[PDB]
């Protein structure tokens, strides 16, 4: 029940576009945030950004800025991605997560190993 159902592995060629889906379940989806964490074995843990389901707010940090557009369908409770022209450094294990307002990361997604 307390889950963040992601997609499977994504073997995507370079130069193309990459989407994701966080088909979460269990709780209300407005009251919980959606953030996005990378895993490389080189650096460790990295960021993409955030989407606010209540206010419609969204942001992305400077390395992912210019590529990522965070949208979500609130009725179907599916987060999304629009990555644009990735590299082999962007091949990583991505994570849909959740935050509260002044809370902490309750749930953790499974990890989509997007390998380019």
């Amino acid at each position: 029940q307390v889950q963040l159902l992601q997609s499977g592995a994504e073997l995507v060629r370079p130069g193309a576009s990459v989407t994701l889906s966080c088909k979460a379940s269990g709780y209300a989806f407005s009251d919980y945030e959606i953030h996005w964490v990378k895993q490389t074995p080189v650096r460790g843990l990295d960021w993409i950004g955030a989407f606010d389901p209540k206010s419609g707010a969204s942001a992305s940090n400077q390395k992912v800025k210019g590529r990522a557009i965070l949208t979500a369908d609130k009725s179907s409770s599916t987060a999304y991605m629009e990555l644009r022209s990735l590299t082999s450094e962007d091949s990583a294990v991505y994570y849909c997560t959740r935050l509260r307002y002044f809370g902490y990361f309750d749930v953790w997604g499974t990890g989509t190993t997007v390998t380019v």
Partner: peptide, 9 residues
């Protein structure tokens, strides 16, 4: 496995 919490504050 996915990363998990230890301490939130």
């Amino acid at each position: 496995q996915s990363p998990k919490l230890l301490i939130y504050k």
